Design an enzyme around this catalytic site. Structure first.
Site, PDB file in Angstrom:
ATOM      1  N   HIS A  25      32.901 -43.071 -27.022  1.00 18.67           N
ATOM      2  CA  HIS A  25      33.132 -41.956 -27.927  1.00 18.67           C
ATOM      3  C   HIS A  25      33.291 -42.434 -29.421  1.00 18.67           C
ATOM      4  O   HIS A  25      34.136 -41.912 -29.991  1.00 18.67           O
ATOM      5  CB  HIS A  25      34.127 -41.022 -27.143  1.00 18.67           C
ATOM      6  CG  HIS A  25      33.715 -40.402 -26.148  1.00 18.67           C
ATOM      7  ND1 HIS A  25      33.429 -38.726 -26.212  1.00 18.67           N
ATOM      8  CD2 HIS A  25      33.740 -40.843 -24.914  1.00 18.67           C
ATOM      9  CE1 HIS A  25      32.769 -38.451 -24.947  1.00 18.67           C
ATOM     10  NE2 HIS A  25      33.315 -39.431 -24.052  1.00 18.67           N
ATOM     11  N   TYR A 291      42.630 -46.460 -22.389  1.00 14.93           N
ATOM     12  CA  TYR A 291      42.745 -46.000 -23.654  1.00 14.93           C
ATOM     13  C   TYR A 291      43.758 -46.797 -24.645  1.00 14.93           C
ATOM     14  O   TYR A 291      43.418 -47.145 -25.817  1.00 14.93           O
ATOM     15  CB  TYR A 291      42.921 -44.529 -23.902  1.00 14.93           C
ATOM     16  CG  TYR A 291      41.826 -43.613 -23.155  1.00 14.93           C
ATOM     17  CD1 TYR A 291      41.990 -42.196 -23.639  1.00 14.93           C
ATOM     18  CD2 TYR A 291      41.020 -43.871 -22.418  1.00 14.93           C
ATOM     19  CE1 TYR A 291      41.241 -41.367 -23.038  1.00 14.93           C
ATOM     20  CE2 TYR A 291      40.008 -43.223 -22.066  1.00 14.93           C
ATOM     21  CZ  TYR A 291      40.113 -41.637 -22.116  1.00 14.93           C
ATOM     22  OH  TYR A 291      39.360 -41.004 -21.442  1.00 14.93           O
TER      23      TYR A 291
END
Ligand code: HEM
EC number: 1.11.1.-
Length: 303
Positions: A25, A291
């Protein structure tokens, strides 16, 4: 099983984990808006942003690719992540993307599919092989296609959170839900033909022009788990059709306040709040760790 670093390696090996970019992303833009829940949402969760008051909302629309220069007109998953600011200054996130169900029930399965979809080299064979090793996925081919459609606008497609979350109300009652962010604008997609001629960043140009015309709205709906609906497997289809709108995210324009100086913006599905608890979903639990690794790489700071 699989470690956060191994996930990053797999991602890097497929073209992601680019310098200073979110490992996946990579390409995306931040927008500003607000969120207001319906009056009955408070019966489902005690979370402060669901009590009917209007709260600040930060939204990032993105392309799932690890390539920051990914062309919008190319097939691919799109993401819509929302960060709500609560009265005490704390924040809670909702992360969603275009696929209706997760491709795998485990972090291992996801990474394997990611690698099988690596270079265009022998992709057909690699994907075919993966499918034989993952029957369930092979029986939902239409969903894989649907997840990679080319939207005419970030505002004209829907996004799904996939994982089940336990929502607890003030009365102590609880229910498991899956998140769905649905557009109030009519869903609209482009053909391969039309998408081919589009500018690389036509989606951000489209959204900028769209917002100039007026606010963009997404209704936040929750699908409430049924008697045989798995709260741990995000790849498992739910039979429940008990889906209710609990609020609306109203987006008014691009953000210019965030990601400057030393500000870091990360949408973590595990960043819940009082009244919301994560399910025993292994992918959900794994994501916060990956993450943190991705953030450390692009910023230099770890947590
Ligand atoms: C175990 C598999 C998964 C891995 C390894 C993974 C990994 C990542 C990574 C590395 C990022 C960039 C993070 C950053 O630096 O801030 C990211 C972003 C994102 N992921 Fe995942 N992800 C996974 C599964 C999912 C799933 C199932 C969803 C569906 C809800 C999802 C939705 C998103 C979204 C919406 C973003 C955008 C974040 C933004 O725009 O700031 N991811 N993911």
């Amino acid at each position: 099983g699989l470690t956060p670093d191994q996930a990053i390696d797999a991602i890097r090996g497929t073209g992601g984990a680019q310098p200073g970019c979110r490992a996946l992303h990579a390409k995306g833009t931040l927008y500003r808006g607000t969120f207001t829940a319906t009056r009955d949402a408070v019966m489902l969760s005690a979370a402060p942003h669901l009590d009917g008051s209007t709260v600040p909302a930060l939204i990032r629309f993105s392309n799932g690719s690890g390539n920051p220069k990914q062309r919008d007109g190319a097939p691919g998953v799109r993401g819509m992540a929302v960060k709500f600011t609560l009265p005490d200054g704390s924040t809670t996130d909702v992360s969603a993307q275009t696929a209706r169900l997760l491709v795998s029930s485990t972090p291992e399965g996801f990474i394997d599919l990611l690698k099988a979809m690596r270079p265009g080299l022998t992709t057909p064979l690699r994907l075919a092989t993966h499918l034989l090793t993952h029957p369930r996925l092979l029986g939902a081919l239409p969903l894989l296609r649907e997840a990679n459609r080319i939207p005419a606008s970030y505002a004209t497609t829907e996004y799904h959170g996939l994982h089940a979350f336990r929502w607890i109300a003030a009365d102590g009652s609880a229910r498991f839900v899956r998140y769905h962010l649905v557009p109030t604008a009519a869903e609209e997609y482009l053909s391969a033909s039309d998408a081919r001629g589009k500018d690389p960043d036509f989606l951000t140009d489209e959204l900028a022009a769209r917002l100039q015309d007026g606010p963009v709205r997404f209704d936040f709906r929750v699908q409430i788990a049924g008697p045989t609906d798995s709260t741990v497997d995000p790849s498992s289809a739910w039979q429940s059709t008990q889906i209710v709108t609990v609020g609306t995210v109203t987006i008014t324009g691009p953000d210019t306040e965030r990601e400057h100086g030393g500000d870091i913006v990360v949408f973590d599905p595990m960043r819940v709040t009082d009244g919301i608890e994560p399910s025993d979903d292994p992918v959900l639990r794994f994501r916060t760790l990956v993450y943190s690794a991705s953030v450390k790489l692009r910023t230099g700071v770890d947590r």
